[PDB]
Write a protein that binds this ligand. Structure first.
Ligand code: Y01
Ligand code: Y01
Ligand code: Y01
Ligand code: Y01
Ligand code: NAG
Ligand code: NAG
Ligand code: NAG
Ligand code: CL
Ligand code: NA
Ligand code: NA
Length: 525
């Protein structure tokens, strides 16, 4: 009928391979682990992984396969009254795309700036450089006032790319080059969606192999760098005392729900095209193992780079980097300078970032569009109308993202990254999914359908995880965060005014309130 299906299982595998693999495995994980002490981030990370990450991902895949519907419509046949989880997921992904494409815009700016003989961030002698700047090579000299010194890479990222304002209360003026880069990326996405240009043919081999080969050579270079042992020890060995703060637990619980693309309506859409009699269990387990291994292995390379930088700069590891949403843009551009012929490797690395980010970008944008289409199949899922819908959505998203390319858009970006598609809202959605599935629908009723589909009956390692481990963890993290409140501080120094915190809380509540509002609306009818 109108609903189409995958031509072969290889399409599903290659779709998921780019959909939850991208910037969240090599960009968000490093500074999230770096800010929260280091090794202490891993214990709650693995606990949340084996407690809810694979279980909820597999549950979403099974609901998609068993319902043959999108993010919003599956809950209509699962539990009509507890609908609104799909609406919250759509809100989360809509707010996520806006600031997710800004990273791609920064990558495009870096790639365009890479097209000359000398990389601009290698040295600091330009107009934007402070008199405080000097090269990292000579920073450790006893002659060279050891607190006000700064590295060329940090100054470049702070002024040339960002032009950081004193605070969110001074937006400044708009930057036109960043707006052009954002428009270019949005045009590329629109052309890749409108004409259906995708990874179909022999190009999939390159599209899948090249990022992993680049990651492997990056890891080899990082592990070869001196001072990597200190970075590895910082990354692995935990601190027991830091475990008493809710921030580490809530960051670890959010990396599992973010990198795996959970609670945003993409996995159910991807599983909606699968075959009824298809063994999704083994494929889902293998893909989850691949994703977790990707995050874990990229952590080794990036923390070895951080350890080398801390060793060369003469300072400690915890105060050698930006420790915010832009740690990768200091860590990796510093790494590509050591490799022979730096320009070629820089171009390759930025193309690799663009590829990993874009395939996911397309995945979640298409998931959002399909979820919206499933609500109105008559007025959408059409020709020119479906074109103008995507065009209007892209234009609105570009206009909204224009607010983060000004001189004071870094604070807005950090606020979005903390309150938009992560934190309390993700725990809210995951709890309300696992609770309903385990208690109202029934965990034993789903095993019968699973046996009908995959052929055999799985074990109880997941029926208990959907019913006990996940709700307890979600409620505990929520209560612990509420009891001990610590305000957000960008780069440990900036103090956000009360109105900014209220704006962030309103951003989070816009997604959180969907469930109670839908419940009361349905009960009123
Ligand atoms: C505004 C910020 C927080 C970003 C969120 C944007 C979207 C996720 C929102 C904005 C407007 C919402 C729409 C507003 C009105 C409706 C009509 C509503 O229709 C009904 O009440 C059901 C009718 C029926 O049963 O046919 C269905 C949800 C929908 C499409 C909403 C879906 C979610 C939308 C697109
Ligand atoms: C409803 C959600 C989806 C969007 C809400 C608006 C946001 C896009 C935020 C991001 C940056 C914010 C702005 C950041 C800085 C300022 C300056 C602040 O004070 C000034 O106007 C300073 C003097 C001047 O800028 O002329 C007033 C609020 C405002 C415009 C903020 C209004 C709300 C903005 C546009
Ligand atoms: C806050 C930012 C991030 C939102 C960016 C995307 C929106 C501009 C898009 C996303 C989903 C869109 C909606 C998806 C589906 C429909 C149903 C369809 O209904 C109509 O033809 C009119 C409905 C009405 O009068 O509300 C077209 C409008 C609407 C609400 C769309 C309006 C524009 C929306 C909210
Ligand atoms: C602008 C700033 C302050 C952010 C807050 C925006 C909210 C006022 C918006 C954002 C998303 C909206 C929701 C998007 C989708 C829906 C689904 C829509 O359809 C139903 O749930 C009706 C179901 C039925 O009637 O059978 C009802 C409105 C609602 C909850 C919307 C209510 C208003 C919300 C929460
Ligand atoms: C820095 O620029 C000044 C101004 O032209 C020049 O005299 C100096 O040699 C430059 N130094 C380096 C290390 O590039
Ligand atoms: C420190 O400065 C002196 C100045 O003569 C120079 O000889 C020395 O090489 C510098 N140290 C390093 C590690 O380059
Ligand atoms: C950095 O050192 C001190 C910091 O106490 C500062 O007063 C001084 O002006 C700075 N000097 C240089 C050369 O940057
Ligand atoms: Cl991860
Ligand atoms: Na990807
Ligand atoms: Na991921």
């Amino acid at each position: 009928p109108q609903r189409e299906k995958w031509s072969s299982k290889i399409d599903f595998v290659l779709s998921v391979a780019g959909g939850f693999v991208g910037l969240g495995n090599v960009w968000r994980f490093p500074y999230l682990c770096y800010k929260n002490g280091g090794g202490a981030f891993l214990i709650p990370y693995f606990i949340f992984l084996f407690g809810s990450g694979l279980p909820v991902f597999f549950l979403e895949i099974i609901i998609g396969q068993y319902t043959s519907e999108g993010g919003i419509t599956c809950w209509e046949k699962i539990c009509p009254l507890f609908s609104g989880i799909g609406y919250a997921s759509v809100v989360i992904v809509s707010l996520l795309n806006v600031y997710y494409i800004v990273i791609l815009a920064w990558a495009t700016y870096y790639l365009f700036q890479s097209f000359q003989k000398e990389l601009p961030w290698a040295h600091c002698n330009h107009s934007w450089n402070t008199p405080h700047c000097m090269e990292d090579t000579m920073r450790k000299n006893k002659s060279v006032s050891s607190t006000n010194f700064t590295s060329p890479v940090i100054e470049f990222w702070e002024r040339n790319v960002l032009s950081l304002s004193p605070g969110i209360d001074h937006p400044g003026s708009l930057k036109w080059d960043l707006a052009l880069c954002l428009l270019l990326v949005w045009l590329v996405c629109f052309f890749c969606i409108w004409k259906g240009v995708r990874s179909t043919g022999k190009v999939v081999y390159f599209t899948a192999t090249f990022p992993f080969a680049m990651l492997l050579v990056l890891l080899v270079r990082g592990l070869t760098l001196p001072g990597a042992g200190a970075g590895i020890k910082f990354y692995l060995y935990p601190d027991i005392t830091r475990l008493e703060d809710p921030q580490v637990w809530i960051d670890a619980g959010t990396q599992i729900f973010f990198s795996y693309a959970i609670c945003l309506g993409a996995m159910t859409s991807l599983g909606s095209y699968n075959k009824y009699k298809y063994n999704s269990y083994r494929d889902c387990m293998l893909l989850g193992c691949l994703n977790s291994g990707t995050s874990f292995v990229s952590g080794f390379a990036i923390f070895s780079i951080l350890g080398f930088m801390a060793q060369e700069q003469g300072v400690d590891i915890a105060d050698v980097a930006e420790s915010g949403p832009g740690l990768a843009f200091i860590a990796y551009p510093k790494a590509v300078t050591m490799m022979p012929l730096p320009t070629f490797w820089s171009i390759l690395f930025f193309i690799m970032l663009l590829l990993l980010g874009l395939d996911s970008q397309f995945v979640e944008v298409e998931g959002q569009i399909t979820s919206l289409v499933d609500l109105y199949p008559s007025f959408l899922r059409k020709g020119y109308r479906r074109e103008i819908f995507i065009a209007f959505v892209c234009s609105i998203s570009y206009l909204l993202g224009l607010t983060m390319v000004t001189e004071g858009g870094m604070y807005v970006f950090q606020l979005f990254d903390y309150y938009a598609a992560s934190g309390v809202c993700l725990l809210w959605v995951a709890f309300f999914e696992c609770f309903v599935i385990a208690w109202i629908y029934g965990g034993d009723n789903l095993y019968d359908g699973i046996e009908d589909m995959i052929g055999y009956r799985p074990g109880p390692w997941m029926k208990y995880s959907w019913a006990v481990i996940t709700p307890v963890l979600c409620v505990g993290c929520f209560i612990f965060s509420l009891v001990k409140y610590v305000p957000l501080t960008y780069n440990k120094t900036y103090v956000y005014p009360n109105w900014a915190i209220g704006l962030g809380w309103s951003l989070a509540l816009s997604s959180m309130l969907c469930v109670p509002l839908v419940i009361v609306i349905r009960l009123c009818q």
